[PDB]
Each structure stands twice: as structure tokens, then as C-alpha cells.
Design a protein around this ligand. Sequence first.
Ligand SMILES: [Cu+2]
Ligand SMILES: [Cu+2]
Ligand code: NA
Ligand code: NA
Ligand code: NA
Ligand code: NA
Ligand code: NI
Length: 307
Amino acid sequence: CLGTIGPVTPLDASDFALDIRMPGVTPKESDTYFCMSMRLPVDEEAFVIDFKPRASMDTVHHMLLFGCNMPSSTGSYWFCDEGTCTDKANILYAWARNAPPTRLPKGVGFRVGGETGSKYFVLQVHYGDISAFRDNHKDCSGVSVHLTRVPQPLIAGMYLMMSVDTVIPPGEKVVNADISCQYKMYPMHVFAYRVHTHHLGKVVSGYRVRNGQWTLIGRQNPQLPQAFYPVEHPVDVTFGDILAARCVFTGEGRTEATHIGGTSSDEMCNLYIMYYMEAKYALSFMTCTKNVAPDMFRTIPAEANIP
Ligand SMILES: [Cu+2]
Ligand SMILES: [Cu+2]
Ligand code: NA
Ligand code: NA
Ligand code: NA
Ligand code: NA
Ligand code: NI
């Protein structure tokens, strides 16, 4: 816990570290999601060029940091059952125990603040085993974020791919959630990926399709720590390519149909593609919910079907 010196640490003339911590929380039941927000100190446009995790190695499972203009609650801390942000939450950072977080390359920063950038950070901390709190303890875990107002030559962004209409029948052995959009912006370069799914998902796979050629971006089992994993060969996606993604679900162990939604008993098929772009061509966020080329999913690498 910080104390009398507050959450802002000045680094030089135009740099500062902003500590985003929990306000000394104490959970009640096993598996709890706490969320809290931080207005940015600056109104001027700024660049998040670094994150440092400040979490206890014996109690925290995962951490998530978002940028949005309308956080879910105004309270000091809240339960993320009430969601994270009313508007679209732009994910900036993830932390996992078993997955050592990769760093942002130098000259690459998330554009925040200003006219159009995010006005708030929302921190989400998952406390798995509460039995690690023999007493009240009072926990102030969170993220330290490096801000600079020096324009970065490369701007980081997120290309989010998600399913909306996926319906998983009870006991059905395999249900695919296919997603596809054509890319219509300037080149992006993918360097990290994150997959998200609930308890029913078996595998999530992301590709770039160019002239009918499937180029792997990320392939992960979603039941493993859902951190940001680095891409092996850095992939460029350019005007004309089709981004395709498939989550493989199963309906086994369910009495009723499962669809896409917020609750634990609902499902999700998310692939977060963290890219970078030349600052002057850059846009911070892109989204695909469509499946514009379903016929294309015929020539999908078989590897995207087996676990
Ligand atoms: Cu977790
Ligand atoms: Cu979810
Ligand atoms: Na730093
Ligand atoms: Na939630
Ligand atoms: Na919208
Ligand atoms: Na189940
Ligand atoms: Ni390139």
C-alpha cells in the first residue's frame, strides 16, 4: 500500500509512473473478481510505454488492465459481476502466475488521454484461493504503469475478434465458433495474442489469410493462464487480408444450451490480437464480430480442430 506519497511518481520532465492499486480489499468467498478505476491525471494525450506488476506471488491468479471512458462503478472498489466498463473496454495488459508477461518493444506505446484516448484505467484482480488469507491481511495489489507525453514512433493497439451468435447445444461433442473479417486499414504488426473462453472451450486459434494462405498468429488452450503470449514470427496484416479465428467448444456436462454472454454459465470466444502501427497510420482499436467468409473455413489448418 502506497501511503502519504500517492499514486503518481514523477520520472522526469514529461514522464511519470502511475500506481494502480486495490484500496486495501478483503474478499469474502472463493474466486472473487474485484475492479477499480483511476482517472488519468493528465487531460493531454499520453503514451503508456511500460507496465510493472505489483502483486503477491502467493495469492493472485491473474490481473487485467483496461482503458475505457465509462467504468462500470463509481465505488472505490466493486465486484466485476457489475462488469468492467459500460462502454468498450480496451485491454492494455495482462498478468499470469505461470506465464511470465512479455514486455512492449521500445518505441511502442498505447495512446491514452487527449481528445479520443481513454480517460480511465480499470484494474481487474482475480483472487482464486482466499484460504491464503489467514487473517484480514488487507491487500493493495495492482499495476504500475509508465506514462510519457513524448509521442511514440509506433502506437500499440488491439484487434479484438469475438463471437456473438454462438449457440452450444447440450452434450454436443464439438461446436465451432468461426469469426472472419477482411482487413481494410494500414499494415499492423502482431506481436502478442490473448485468448478468452469459459469452462467449455477446448482450443482457440487465430490466423491471417492472404491469397488463400493461412498464417498462424496464435493457438492456445484457453484453460491455461489467459495471459498475453508473444507471437513467434512477427506477422504483418495488410489491406486485403482476411483475419480468421475459431474457438472449439463442447456442450458436454451441461443440461441446457450455452450462448455468448457475461455470466460464468455463459460462454465467450475472444481473441485479443495486440499489434503495433506506424504512429501516423495508427488506430488504437479494431473489432470483428462478423463471419464474412464462412466458406473459407474449409481450408483451415487441421491443427485448429485437435486440442
Ligand atoms: Cu485468474
Ligand atoms: Cu469471459
Ligand atoms: Na519503465
Ligand atoms: Na465480468
Ligand atoms: Na460501439
Ligand atoms: Na460443464
Ligand atoms: Ni513487416
